[PDB]
Enzyme design. Structure first.
Site, PDB file in Angstrom:
ATOM      1  NE  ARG A   1      -0.992  -2.911   2.008  1.00  0.00           N
ATOM      2  CZ  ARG A   1      -0.450  -4.123   2.051  1.00  0.00           C
ATOM      3  NH1 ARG A   1      -0.536  -4.932   1.000  1.00  0.00           N
ATOM      4  NH2 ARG A   1       0.157  -4.541   3.156  1.00  0.00           N
TER       5      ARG A   1
ATOM      6  CB  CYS B   1      -4.452  -2.973   6.226  1.00  0.00           C
ATOM      7  SG  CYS B   1      -3.311  -2.003   5.215  1.00  0.00           S
TER       8      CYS B   1
ATOM      9  CB  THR C   1      -1.962   2.153   4.042  1.00  0.00           C
ATOM     10  OG1 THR C   1      -1.709   0.744   4.007  1.00  0.00           O
ATOM     11  CG2 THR C   1      -0.930   2.831   4.936  1.00  0.00           C
TER      12      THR C   1
ATOM     13  CB  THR D   1       3.462   3.185   9.142  1.00  0.00           C
ATOM     14  OG1 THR D   1       2.325   3.370   8.288  1.00  0.00           O
ATOM     15  CG2 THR D   1       3.279   1.916   9.956  1.00  0.00           C
TER      16      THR D   1
ATOM     17  CE  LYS E   1       7.627  -6.810   9.634  1.00  0.00           C
ATOM     18  NZ  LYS E   1       7.284  -6.139   8.350  1.00  0.00           N
TER      19      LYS E   1
ATOM     20  CB  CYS F   1       1.472  -0.177  14.394  1.00  0.00           C
ATOM     21  SG  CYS F   1       1.792   0.819  12.934  1.00  0.00           S
TER      22      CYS F   1
END
Lengths: 228, 228
Positions: free
Chosen positions: A48, A82, A84, A124, A164, A194
């Site tokens: 994306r 998600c 985006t 993000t 992550k 997130c």
């Protein structure tokens, strides 16, 4: 009863986490009282962020394909783990008959209902540039506040190279430092954009309400599935 | 690349956990390299244990209905995150066209490959009564060892009144104690028959290998989905 459809694969891990939260947030004493869920995890949906910036493949074809398949498979409504991807929520809505409940919009509605006027966003860079939170929050009269470009690099590093990557200490250090900064600037609530944020950052580390969009959409989906 | 189908809802949490493990066990440099997964979570399938113990209706009709819908939605093969449901794996296989990979048989194969001759099983009473592990392990020449009736009550307490209730101290206390007893009786490996077991029992806690059937089927599913 309404069957929950999850348009996932963005990414696989976030999809599995959304599913888990739905189960945890479901009031039941026996398996048979839980709502039906049909998940189509399609990782081949093009990145994306890469598209948002203007150089990657258009992710809408696969997004729409997955939405149509969920409908064909039996979903009564769709949710997407998600941020985006919600930049194309209208494109997807035009191609299907069943509705898509937006994680971004439901969060904006919740923030408004709680009376907040200014919200600090931890997410993000792709999410921010897509402007999905800014668009929906403004519709509900809530002002979005994000970190500076330098501080944003920290948020990104903390989320990716930090959480992550399995380095929790680095992630919590970078993310907690940024959270308090937003509070210092007047944020009435902190938005954990997130899942990685909720991992290292807890409500006990902040003086203002901590809101996780994934918890919001999981709760809305459970309610709709069990009350409609 | 093949599409992994998950016939779930038995129960919802176990289904979500199987999905998470597939993601965790998938080697990839980016989202787009992960395999497609279609999950049909149908909690309404009649209780398996109840039917096994003879105090409930046949779950086969709806197990088959769910498998067919999963096949229609696009799965290339099916896996199930439920031990007792495998008691009817042949009935399901005969009713559909796509393959069903058995978590029980793949675990039995793994145990033999690792050279074990006796395995201590930690699972629900229903699972033990169904005899799925005993049937498959015997085929591969491996002897199953389970707790006594009283110790089995401790296991059930540790899984349900413990882990599932959010009390990990109770869960670990009862499950670790039983695991050590089986080790003392000669178990060459411990089979974590329920995801709850893996939550409080870790490899470092044992002197013998801890085998998790869910990890085994997750690894096989990823291999099959990405192989040849």
């Amino acid at each position: 009863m309404k069957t929950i459809g999850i348009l996932g694969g963005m990414g696989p891990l976030a999809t599995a986490e959304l599913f888990r939260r739905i189960v945890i947030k479901t009031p039941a004493k026996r398996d048979q009282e839980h709502p039906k869920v049909i998940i189509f995890n399609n990782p081949q949906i093009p990145d994306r962020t890469a598209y948002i910036l203007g150089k990657g493949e258009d992710p809408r074809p696969q997004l729409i394909w997955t939405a149509k398949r969920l409908e064909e498979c039996g979903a009564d409504f769709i949710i997407m783990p998600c941020n985006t991807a919600h930049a194309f929520v209208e494109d997807i809505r035009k191609a299907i008959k069943i509705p898509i409940i937006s994680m971004i919009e439901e969060t904006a509605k919740k923030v408004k209902e709680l009376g907040f006027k200014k919200a600090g966003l931890l997410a993000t860079t792709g999410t921010i540039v897509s402007g999905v939170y800014e668009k929906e929050f403004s519709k509900y009269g809530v002002e979005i506040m994000t970190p500076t470009e330098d501080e944003q690099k920290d948020v990104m590093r903390g989320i990716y190279e930090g959480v992550k990557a399995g380095n929790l200490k680095l992630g919590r250090e970078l993310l907690l430092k940024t959270a308090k900064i937003l509070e210092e600037r007047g944020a009435e609530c902190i938005i954990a954009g997130c899942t990685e944020v909720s991992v290292v950052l807890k409500q006990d580390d902040l003086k203002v309400p901590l809101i996780d969009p994934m918890d919001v959409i999981a709760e809305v989906a459970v309610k709709v599935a069990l009350e409609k």
